[PDB]
């Protein structure tokens, strides 16, 4: 079983014959580590900020929740047919339309009867 | 022994306390006070609401915007700058 002494396995590098500026100082190593750490999370941080803005808007809507705390508005009734002036007239309305209206209203209310 | 670590119960207790803050007589009193303030402010204003709901866009800002936009778009022609608008 071979031994291979460490003088044939280790690098005898002397930090004197190196060119000037090659040997990194502690401040340069700290700056490089900070840059690596920022580059390893920059896109994640920006995507999290955008998603956090969207989540803040959604949480504001959740705090709005329902209708409570809001007055009724005469400029904005809850029905667009009230807001505009839309009425059925002589052309279009037919007797069977009452049956179809009944079926659509049953489906919209959520009952399976017709 | 201690299963209390990773406190999902403690992070849900914030939502539980948030739900318990409302649906109380204090929140009902606050809502009725806000209704009183809304009623007072709605009786006070009565003009600014019509200005902001009817006048401000349709009869103040939108005609200005479409006239400026048309004059910025169409060529320097008598028909396109005067007669057609």
């Amino acid at each position: 079983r071979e031994a291979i002494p460490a003088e044939l396995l280790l690098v005898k590098e002397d930090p004197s014959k190196l060119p000037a500026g090659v040997l990194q100082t502690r401040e340069q190593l700290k700056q490089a580590q900070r840059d690596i750490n920022w580059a390893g999370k920059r896109e994640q941080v920006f995507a999290a900020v955008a998603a956090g803005w969207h989540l803040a808007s959604f949480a504001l809507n959740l705090a709005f929740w329902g209708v409570e705390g809001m007055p009724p508005d005469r400029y904005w009734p809850t029905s667009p047919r009230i807001r505009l002036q839309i009425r059925p007239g002589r052309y279009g309305n037919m007797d069977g339309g009452q049956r179809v209206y009944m079926d659509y209203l049953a489906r919209s209310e959520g009952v399976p009867l017709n | 022994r201690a299963l209390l670590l990773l406190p999902f119960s403690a992070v849900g207790g914030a939502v539980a306390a948030w739900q318990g803050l409302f649906n109380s007589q204090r929140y009902e009193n606050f809502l009725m006070s806000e209704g009183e303030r809304i009623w007072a402010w709605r009786n006070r204003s009565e003009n600014e609401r019509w200005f902001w709901e009817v006048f401000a866009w349709d009869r103040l800002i939108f005609p200005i915007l479409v006239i400026v936009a048309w004059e910025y778009l169409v060529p320097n022609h008598l028909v396109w700058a005067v007669l057609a608008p």
């Binding site: 904005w76 667009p80 807001r83 505009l84 | 902001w52 709901e53 401000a56 866009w57």
Partner: peptide, 29 residues
Amino acid sequence: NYQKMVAFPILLSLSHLLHRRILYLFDTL
């Protein structure tokens, strides 16, 4: 002066007009 003073009423008006314009865009659709 005037930095966030000539902006806040204008941004308030823009937000209100934008919301009413979205509601009226639903109305015209």
